[model samples]
Target chain A: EAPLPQLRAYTVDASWLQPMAPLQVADHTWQIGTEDLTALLVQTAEGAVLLDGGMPQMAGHLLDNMKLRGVAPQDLRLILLSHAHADHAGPVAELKRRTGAHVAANAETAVLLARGGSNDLHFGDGITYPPASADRIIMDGEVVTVGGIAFTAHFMPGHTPGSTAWTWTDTRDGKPVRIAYADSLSAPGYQLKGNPRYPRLIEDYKRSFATVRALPCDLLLTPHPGASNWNYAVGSKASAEALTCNAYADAAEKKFDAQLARETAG
Target chain B: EAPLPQLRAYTVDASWLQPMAPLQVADHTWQIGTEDLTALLVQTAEGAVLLDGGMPQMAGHLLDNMKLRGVAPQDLRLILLSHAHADHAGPVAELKRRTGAHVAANAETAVLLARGGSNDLHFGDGITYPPASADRIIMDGEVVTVGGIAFTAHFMPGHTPGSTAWTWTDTRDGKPVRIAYADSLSAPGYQLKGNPRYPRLIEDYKRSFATVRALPCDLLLTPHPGASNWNYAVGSKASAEALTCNAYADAAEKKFDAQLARETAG
Candidate 1:
């Protein structure tokens, strides 16, 4: 099944990464720009809701787009964060200010964001984080419906204590509603489906993958752009199935977990 | 009362203040070089004490001076800080580590030096402070009798909250012992001793003056030259009649007190 045409997803210019801006399938469903990753903005009859905002530098550009599109600050009611990393939610504070938006996230993500603290900065020494803060928290499994658009907040910890992905269903082109899960997995190298998983995440990667597989996804809207291989082998319809997305997830999980386990066990 | 045989003092090149280490002080303590401020290296039976170490740039030159005088870092017993601002205390931490010498300051002075939180960065602004922690904290009324010479701590908190002065009686010339007071007062025009107080430190000017007046000071060795007149009035015969030095001290104190009063009232 092909995904419905998202209302003109303009790629915001964030140098050095795959930059994608608000990707709204229709009028009420969108993604705000986050990272060089993705930011989804969705509009429903109830109001306009935005996902992660982009980095600090990109906030100004996002504001301009919002104004040009006639999205009033007050009308932009909800913000669902995908995670608390610098690139993912760096401009969250600015987004809330410009849009008067309330944020919804899993409890763990909310707690980490509330302190304006993120493990992303200290990890691996070279890792740097763009500063940001989050407000108006939501929890796991909680359904947040905006203008008839129903979405579920999924707590997927491992990459970071509070990393999250949102599961939502939307009917488009007058067809049955389809599922779109963002940031449920990074590229295929992540090992979420193999035995003795190539551990990249802590032991928690399995649980997070299970959470995503349980959801009914007719269409997949990933957090990162250009991640789908439309090449010959994984052509068209079976593209995701062909991907050892689960193997990638599991292996990565095994790699990281084994190291941590070694460090911990020893 | 007249000040004592004020050792004529002047700033010279510290050899550290590079590109023409402009002799910040002129003659009084005769020096081989005209530009560099020959660091004051005072030694007693107890050990060697350096009033100021100059800047890190001058550390090499200071070492040279010690060599010329047949002295070494091991002989350096203590570094008595005047006020703990970088100009005065910047070299203290490193020098203490190098020489295995001890650093002592008044309690309040220690607090400010330590105000930089844990990472040697300022807790508030994260700027301008030396990214090093002070070793030991000493305070007013505390006495350090190193090498048989007892230096008394005096809290002269006008220039900065923890500005300090130290005094000790020395009888090196087989004459009456003289109390040497560090050039603890610098805010220009402070010793004006007349009205039209200097605006910067209008408060505490008086209390600072009063505190010093109550002390039994016969000689003053200030950080800067011209602090008192050419000769320390206290050292001259019938020095009790000299008014130049005392007048300046009185003036400086009054202005400091006025400034403090205004701050409190506000």
Candidate 2:
């Protein structure tokens, strides 16, 4: 029961696998790793809207996090999920019950969520992952107002149908900042990224990347520790990319011209 | 295993279920028995949309009926659920998965379907049933289109918060025929129809009856057989009215109504 030191740094509660912590990047913004996943809370003039809640078993702790952060359950207005992945939206139904929050995702995500598929296909067995669901569906390029703050939704399909990324304008250090979310995730390890041997729905994979490439963002805000995966010393970006570059490289398209790679490949 | 013989003139699966054959009412028009449950499929030029699909276990047979009738899976575009019940909408999840069909239901039905409450309540207890779910959440009085045919939704809350019925045109004899599909169904027996020993959600029963009475239905359809107990003979209109609805009258007669008549000194 001694506080798990490894997970204490990020996740609100980290007693199990896949420890993550939601980062509080700015005022009215806070993220908590649900011991196994991540969640971000944005407080606006109207109410609080949560993005990507953790698994079902984490509900009690998730509620505790809101209380500790001074966010009342009644103040929650909606839950914006990244995709139909269980780890991203598992406890949504339970949390929505307590907070009366509406769940938002793409139409296809809603289908997978409503029909209820198995997370075990990706997470493996013995894990009691809950089914993902969405209440209010977000379109590919729809704009929704939450707490008086409007966020633009881009239907980034392929990670899963209706997989979406939302963009918003926020000042960090008195300067504008850009961020992106991939519910299906960005540049995971080779074990996860599919190839000819472990090929996933290849068509979906290409579409997912294309969706991300179309965005007008500078900084990529990933659900997992992006580029930070392998940087043990000083969190260097090179080491981070080194730890997870193979999958992206494998999924990238080959250049038509040999000079093109040397000219544009950075 | 031999086909079940629970009812004569009908072939029941090992689960004691069958898709009620479509009864052709006229050219370019047909009426299916709704499998003697609530799931009924109506077809047209564009395709077919199932009214409601019975428990999950009956999904294969339901699809088989579509195929047997030359109904392609792609033609099964939408599924309109009556309510989120174990028996009425049990196979919806599986059906949607197989056909990629969209669903339209009331908010209450949508919420329960999204949360998997149907399984925990009516199914998981030794019953082979499909999970219930809906894709589109519609309001009362909304008209939904499937295969070019349109039906108006009627909100009838009682048996469940979002019990819905649909009204559409079923032309008979080359004349425009208007039919209201009253999908609102009461339980097998109303404990308060005058059975004082049993408790009941009295308010719901009253509201359900009033809703049914006001509905513009030429043909009333219950979730299961109109009577409490299933008997092939009970399919007759006179038999159902006399045995089931009137049976509640008997319970009333043995109580308040009967007592008032006796006081007259007859």
Candidate 3:
């Protein structure tokens, strides 16, 4: 339930695609994604819950990590998505198929996932993956519990039409700890000023920025680990605590406001 | 979704037993307890969820707050508890009877609440309240959802055998905000080192302290608000952010450690 006392850093030529062992992040959770990506596995005694899927091409890497941790295909009971982005949800279709796991997502993202991100509110057809249907369409404040572990969902949009953040509890040394999986809060290449396709894009970003600032998180994980400097925080409590969700949201909001001001100047 | 921008400070002769108006705390929640105590009401469009209950004699105050907030008897779907102490759970049984809400608690607390705190592990028959049965017996990491809202439960045993802390999300300005209801972490009049009733008292306090430090809480409510200097923080962002759950737990841990040392010295 607590953060890995010191997240062990591994050096490699390419952090996104490399041979990395499954790192135990919490008492019942493991970091199965690459050092650059964050794909977590919440291993309950009876079953398992997975958070986010890496790039589709790296499905094998995730499978290898699961296998390494003695988690069988059948043991995977649920696959939770942060959004329908390819980097985060690309391999869920394949992983769900392999494990026969039930995929879950917010109602908005479920629509995107079902269509394989084809008619996405943002990317449209720019990002598409193998279609995977979410069996449970969760609400903003709904909790999806499977295998004795409960994960509460928050509707954090703007990065995608249905960007979601998740929080859950796990135990370490018999003490409870709260962990949060934050969605992408950046506005990279986003048309926040005059997005014709998504009229509510700016408001959505504002909402998301405000939403993520106060999430209950002892240890914060993310799909794009580099955005949060997850690597630098390894083993440094000060570093880990320094850049919390509040700081992350603050930086994103600042950049977002600057971009909006630039658009106004134009 | 967000905190009451600044929690309004109201002066009363007896803050714990004053006639206070139902103050809206978040997008879908309200502070329904007295200025000194902490009780909450989460009103969904369809139903409502309640957190904590004031002293047994002050059940009328809780009902009056709920009535002011337009919460109907049948619409009160769930009553969540932090612990079975008199100040926190005394009015629950009466509230349950009037509202017909499903009282939920940890298994350890379910027993305590059922017996009306008479058979409490710590205070056997020393203190008793109107016995109320917990309809839903929740586990440590489980989520209890009602009326489109989900509350995740964390077992934070120290003051009682089944002390609990809860977390849930509500939107502010259509953005998400996380709120926490922290349990009593004080060791006043507690037998920490050589408690005959609880051999694991020290370990439980350590666990509880570590558990609360990292709870995802934008606004932290407590059974005893005075312990956290909540009154001083009203409407003051700096003061509000200064004493978060992290600071609250740090103080408790420090005090608990000193108490344990004193007992050992003796």
Candidate 4:
């Protein structure tokens, strides 16, 4: 894995710390990370499901945000991961240790977590996270039930080997709504031309794009807010809202396909 | 069912017939319909699975193409219908009668089939078929195993109430390639503006488009060859061939979204 060619400091808010409180996004789902980062707290009568853990440095703010939303560490039943990246899953190890929440991740991600994000096939050691081993390995199409609500895991495996999207249905106004926490499709520092180490890189991304496009999603969230333009209607612009998972996937496929084509042109 | 607003005769070849012989498209998959119309024959030593039945008037040609490809009606084990439309399913009745194949279809398509394509929500009485009932009703994500080969049925109801796409793995040159018989994404005569009877018309179309985009497809095929521009390089231009399912969905989305936006502008 080569380092992300970052000649500048960016995504600090979405990747590091933010001075924002948790805000309720849907019926029982609350964004507890920051303005740019995403760490959702999905509550039920039984307990709560905490999706994603913000960057390692943002742990304090994330915990404070979760507490403000009425979910303490003891109330969290699961700590779900989106991928093996520092921005989205950096605080998983700390949160898992404190809450004793079942850490759920796919096999490839589990490997990276156990290694603390070392020797990544794409990022190499460009960025590493605190070690956090998965307590339960999630399989594609598998359901992880928390507090009576079942979240379906669609293994994406593109942005990183363990990238995944999670979806769950919640009743808001006596009607069921599908809420999806989709993974980032950004191949920012990806080596798409050919990665001898990971022969399935391109294939995995194609499948992931298709998978995201098909998700029965209504309220779409992303690792980075701008990825789905998450909740633009709520604050940014009343007219612009988050793109549906289908539209989001379409955008991703265009980028990945164009990148591959450019690489193949050589 | 309302009549499809037709002042002009279109998709004649893709809808009816054309001069073409049976040609193998992939390992065990054969295109045995015409230049435009698509009817795929997937065979194994145990038996064969026939996808789409072409038009009623084209039954004779479809059978002749199959026979030329060395697959007699007796050798067929399954007859799969994509949607409850005349062009793709009109000849299914005849095929089932002669082959005694297991007629498989999703619930919505089964309804139209049982009614002989009468009283369609969108088409009205515009088109009718020989009317073949589904011997086995398929669920949303069910698999139909024929001749030891499994074909996954992805229910994609947009073009018609029972539209679907089938995917299966076929080995060619010692490599496993996914062969998908994708359904039509046409909305030629859709009542998307509003159909009080079917309130979920737009929603269903959205879901179907997303589902088609996510399908794990490599060698993509569609009911109408031009939809994927099926096998353009084989006989047309070498640089141009079938578009992958993802690209196909992207194109479908643009047309559909534009249509909806135009209608919703009111």
Which one wins by TM-score: 2 or 3? Answer: 2
**Per-residue lDDT of model 2, residues A95-157, tens digit only:** 866799888777877766654443223422122233545667776778778876667787755
Model 1, position A184: C-alpha lDDT score: 41
Residue B160 CA displacement from its true place in model 2, Å = 1.7
What is every candidate's C-alpha DockQ against the true complex, given to 2 decimals?
0.03, 0.03, 0.01, 0.01
Clashing residue pairs, backbone N/CA/C < 3 A, model 2: A10-A21, A20-A33, A21-A33, A22-A31, A22-A32, A22-A33, A140-A155, A227-A240, B39-B52, B56-B130
TM-score of each: 0.43, 0.50, 0.47, 0.48
Steric clash pairs (candidate 3): A1-A27, A1-A170, A1-A171, A216-B216, B1-B27, B1-B170, B1-B171, B1-B172
C-alpha lDDT of residue B251 in model 4: 95
Q: Give every candidate's TM-score on chain A.
A: 0.68, 0.68, 0.88, 0.90
Q: Note the Cα lDDT for every prediction shown.
A: 0.50, 0.55, 0.76, 0.76
Which segments of model 2 are wrong by more than 4 Å? A1-33, A42-49, A56-60, A74-80, A91-157, A161-266, B1-51, B67-82, B90-157, B162-201, B207-221, B231-242, B248-266
Q: lDDT winner between 2 and 3, please give it.
A: 3
Per-residue alpha-carbon lDDT of candidate 1 for residues B30-135, written as tens digits (9 for 90 to 100): 1211122224555666566766654433455565665565557788777666655444454554566567766677665665444321112121111112223455
TM-score of chain A of 4: 0.90
Every model's Cα RMSD, please? 16.8, 13.2, 17.4, 16.0
In lDDT terms, how accurate is model 4? 0.76
For model 3 chain A, where is the 10-residue window of minimal lDDT?
A232-241
| Residue A1 lDDT (model 2) | 16
* Model 3, span A1-266: residue lDDT tens: 87677633323237666445677667898878876777899998778888997777778888888888888888888999888877778898898878889987754576567678775655557677788877765646667777678888877888876789999998878888788888888877667765645556787789898889878887777787766667622533312543578888998899889988987876
